[model samples]
Target chain A: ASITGDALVALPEGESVRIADIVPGARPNSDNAIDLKVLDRHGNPVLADRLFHSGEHPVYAVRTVEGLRVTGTANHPLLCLVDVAGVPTLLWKLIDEIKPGDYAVIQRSAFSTVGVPGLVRFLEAHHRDPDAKAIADELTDGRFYYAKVASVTDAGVQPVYSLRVDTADHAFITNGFVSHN
Target chain B: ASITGDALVALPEGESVRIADIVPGARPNSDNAIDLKVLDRHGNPVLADRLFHSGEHPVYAVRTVEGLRVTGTANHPLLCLVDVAGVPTLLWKLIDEIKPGDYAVIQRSAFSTVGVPGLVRFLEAHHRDPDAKAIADELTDGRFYYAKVASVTDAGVQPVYSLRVDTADHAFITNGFVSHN
Candidate 1:
């Protein structure tokens, strides 16, 4: 449920911050919530609901062919496309379930519609969750990409932190990779 | 969702075997399934539905003060008693969530009621899952005990295996510990 503390979290102010540095309701003059916000799966800024520190434990580093990387505990769920019933299906897969050659979801800002048709097709046919299809429809602006996983290796023990967003997705972008809390 | 291949699985015949050595549909007179049967959470015999080999990955070894031990991936769910909302609760917790001093469920052969009142109290007042209460009722024959966790440390990378039981519990007893598949 958490990523390594060193993982990058995209912020609303056009900058990124280490997730470990985030403290809810720590801002001046704020007693209910912090001024900090993180990017959700749809590439939109949402309030950081809370931060969780899940102590030191064994972690895995996953890297994509596109040069994106994120490390987290084995049970941390990530957005990926895995072979389900012999078909490539888009779903939230645990870090342990992800393998080399699997497709990891990456978020980017672009004006072109790349990988939209394939994603839509898979969502319409393979994905059973209605929320995923709705998310795909909202993401058709071409901010999403399917990056092939290049490596997944043990990264030893490290303290992990999870950022919960106020949005229903309960997902945030870290190192440009979509991760679930 | 797997434990180390060397983890012991309890059989209905009062024997134990390494989960990795289990082969589905390999019996001499069987055409559909193997002769293997595992002890479920309710201490009842159930057919081995299938076996899963999730390749090598870092695993954690958890030992209880009662001398029970089981090693599994971080996400592998085990029957544990954890503090929830300031109350001790009985539920399936991921290995990573377990800490020293946490109570792990252990099975034994006994004819006297022990821990049944506390389990029933927790199930009725703390646990949100209805299935847990039902299972607890069936286990009132004094077979279960709450073993305090002694240690949870990294056991290094190793191949992991899982056994699916043909029961609603989807759980089994391993090394006298209750585990969820």
Candidate 2:
């Protein structure tokens, strides 16, 4: 069974997620290491920089990934979502300020018409997610709104994926595939 | 089909080839974009930092990314292999330079490691491919290496990358994939 583009399994409208088409050997080893790359909605890699390598035990794993905070301006915030294992996932950085109730969900998208700056600049500052405002923020982003990534591990599947949205709206999937650490 | 490396996979005698795990996502959005990170060898993401967004790219494609070549006074180089659509397909990066000969077919380890520098220090110089002697000098000496990231574009199987090295070994495929200009 293949799960690509937010698992492509009829996800709820509000609970949108982006995933990559599994390429067979893209999982962590016994040593626990996997690469995380956010793609566009079309199942394509974004940034064109390099793939990330996740450790079996990273300092950023939620366990070690302490301190969930979002500080900075609404145009560019210093935001991060760390796992208990100390793995910092879901870095929806840019301006970096979301009013207490304001929120934004980062669902990967794909478009042949964008770059990092735009991706980072999208969602300058989102309002709260009263009824999935996070997902909405991405939908309304000006351009290049898509994300497809290869989590290497189980793709943080099945589970409701408790996204730990900090007070600043910085999001992190609670224990999203603890394997990367 | 697949390649392996125990931490640092030294060329396997006659077989000179390695396959890095592919991170299906948005990568190589442009020549200015490059993934930088440090890792152990298990293809893990370590010392994660610099996960920020930069400028914008209204036009996106797997064309030769043209920009100034940056070098590592003592830093690693990042490479991306994107599908013709300019979507990152496979990515390869390294902490240091590896040797490649005329007939020497190199293999990228299916697994490795990666990381990003916490504090950013723009590259003052670089050496995409310098003569073996020059590489040795840079390695042996503390002097930095530099190259002009002339142009990087997607060519069929790999990224047709071009960069002006500071030396004769200037502009080499230390890493592979379509190099977005």
Candidate 3:
């Protein structure tokens, strides 16, 4: 399912909480998300900057990614909810600040969506119930304000998250992600 | 002749130039103006920093030098003008900014002088006529208001010099050596 900014979702908490979009790498979808290690006829790496050496560890996993994963073999220009690992990356460092039950939303309208939610399946499948509910609750044709965070962990960080809006207001869920250090 | 601050002197142009008693190395008179590379009881070079290592070029001439050359046996702390090669040293670098005919003053009050005019001499010997005249004029008693620069050169960089006084009001004699770069 896709959630647009116009599509309202309720704050699991009351009207007190607010949310903001501050994820650093939460950029819009691009032409190429996956890599075939594509090279030219000259055999040079298509993307020299992204080339990985032999023993270097890969950044993202293949089939078993946390948030949403894709293996279609071509271009994917749609919005994706990838579980950003916060430990080594920005999220890992943000772990202490972002509690498990915080609230955050990924309104497709924020970055403007791709085609559709094609090949979309939830990673860390056991979680995301609140997100599903919040998305489902938009059924009445009115937008709900927020969604609760199901969980965040070292193994599988959650995709949908909530953060304090940091303006005159704040949280639908208790531990919404706060400002950066 | 003892020249103190109360005396007045004129420039080569015959313009009235007020003189000051700001020559650092200049004192009334003293002993031990010369230095001999002395030996310790154990026969080692007494002064370590001033010691000339073998194969290194000597800093001064063997027999004589321009400006008043000092070479007394013992401690001649009053004013011993030593020639320093303008190579990489900070003093060497400063030598360039310091124009040849630019004036300077080394008032005993500035750095505190010793007993005699031990190092009293121009950096450039020939041009010191005006300064020597001013000093010679103050033969009786009293220090001059300022000293004027005769000249300075690579071969004749004197330790003592006179420059223009920069203040709310100043004396004659242009080009007081300002702060170094």
Candidate 4:
């Protein structure tokens, strides 16, 4: 009904959320479903369709209908980020579980997918493309970043590291912090 | 501590239950585990270890401890036949849910386990070997046949099928109605 990345819904709560097609050309609520992958607490891959629990909580909030509920707080707007694995994963997961090295889709200056460009360049460079780093270096700013999980802190632990936004693509050096929303 | 299958427990009830390994070499009380593959209700493969449900039942009952309970009624002895999918499956599952040609382990003979010269000669004769069937064939006398699920029946069904014992190590045939204890 709306262009990808266009604001799809503006609720009475004054929040406007954009629509992005993680699964291409698949209409929401239609028979065409996007097969999403999720990890259990054990870090094992589970296919979405095979998931069958009547009333229990799954490790990934994304695994359940209620976990994907769109309700939001007045100050906190919901941001949708798709984690890319074999499939584009729309994770309704706890941010705390996200490791630093993990790559995901985020809307920086522009809504874009991360990890691929950097990973591609990393591969191309290995394949004898001398200018590959230039390709990698050119990617910066509000865009994809490559980094690793450094450490996890307590809930009350404030993030000590800041982020850099200058490159066409950004990456975390020590531990870059980006709020998903 | 006991070798798997070395001991068969018969309860005060008429049920004589034979024990089989849910997973080979797996100790019952210990946390030792083996990943198992099984079909979902829709007949899709699901890996048991990777499945996660906080308090919900998974696609296969084997994922939970309670689902592995082997207790049954006087007429219903616990049957320990692994489903052919490589997941050690015990039956007593809803019979109505069973589909045609779902293969599993069953004990059709007086006392069971393979390696009889007669069975081996039967195997060699066919280019392979044989009772559990005789035990199964004669088991119609009222003792429940601890046999694998061979096939499904029509709403009103007849027994016209017979089975072979050969190198295929295969099982019951048409009209091969084996019951699980």
Top lDDT prediction, candidate number: 1
Query: Tens-digit lDDT track for model 1 on B12-117?
Result: 5345688767863233222233466777774556788767777777899998876678999999999876656544556898999899888887765211023543
User: Model 3, A1-181: lDDT tens per residue?
Assistant: 1111111222211111111122223433311122222111111112211111111111211122224221111111111122433111111123323333333332211110121121133323422544442232221111111233344333221232222222232211112111110
Give the runs in model 1 whose Cα sits over 4 Å from its true position.
Answer: A24-35, A83-89, A109-139, B1-181
Tens digits of lDDT, candidate 3, B68-131: 1211111111111222331111111133233333222321111102211322333244325444
List ranges where model 2 is wrong by over 4 Å.
Answer: A1-103, A109-181, B1-66, B71-78, B82-88, B91-181
Which 10 successive residues of model 3 chain B have the least lDDT summed?
A: B71-80
Residues B47-133, model 2: lDDT tens digits: 222211211222111111222222221123334321223221223333132122101111222111111111012112322323322
In angstroms, the error of model 4 at B139 is 84
lDDT of 4 by residue, A1-181 (tens): 1111222222111112332332334333333333433221111222222111111111111111111122111221112233344223333333434433444333221210224433453444352445333333223221233233333233221111111222332221111112222
What's the ranking of the predictions by TM-score, best on top? 1, 2, 4, 3
Which should have the higher lDDT, number 2 or number 4?
4
Which candidate order results from sorting by lDDT in descending order?
1, 4, 2, 3
C-alpha local distance difference test of each model: 0.70, 0.22, 0.22, 0.25
True contacts kept of 3: 0.00
Docking quality level of the chain pair in candidate 3: incorrect
Give a tens-digit lDDT track for model 2, residues A73-165: 123222223221222124443322223322223222211013222323332342232423333322333221222221112223221111112
Q: Which stretch of 10 consecutive residues in model 3 chain A shows the poorest summed lDDT?
A: A70-79
| lDDT (10s digit) by residue, model 4, range B53-152 | 1111111111111111111112221223333332223344444454333332232222212222133333344421142323222212212223333343
DockQ of candidate 2? Answer: 0.01
